[PDB]
Amino acid sequence: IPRPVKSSFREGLTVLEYFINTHGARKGLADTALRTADSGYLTRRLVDV
DNA sequence: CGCCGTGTCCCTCTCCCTATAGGTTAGACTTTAAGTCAATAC
């Protein structure tokens, strides 16, 4: 996002900067959740082989 | 005229009432194993 956020968490974010941060936060959380299953399947296949 | 590669698509796997005939059980009668007492001997 080319804006970008220009406030630290000590100064306190504005409304739009926080709303922009929420994108990446939720994306990372969901990506981690799917990465667990990916790692599990890789482990199972390598164990079988 | 006669056969072979490439492409697309489909599919699969993963994360009512009546009438007859026959079998079943429940219920009571007489018999039997069972619980009981009284006298006795060592």
Curated annotation (Swiss-Prot):
This is DNA-directed RNA polymerase subunit beta'. The RNAP catalytic core consists of 2 alpha, 1 beta, 1 beta' and 1 omega subunit. When a sigma factor is associated with the core the holoenzyme is formed, which can initiate transcription. It comes from the Bacteria. The lineage of its organism: Bacteria, Bacillati, Actinomycetota, Actinomycetes, Mycobacteriales. It comes from Mycobacterium bovis (strain ATCC BAA-935 / AF2122/97). Belongs to the RNA polymerase beta' chain family. DNA-dependent RNA polymerase catalyzes the transcription of DNA into RNA using the four ribonucleoside triphosphates as substrates.
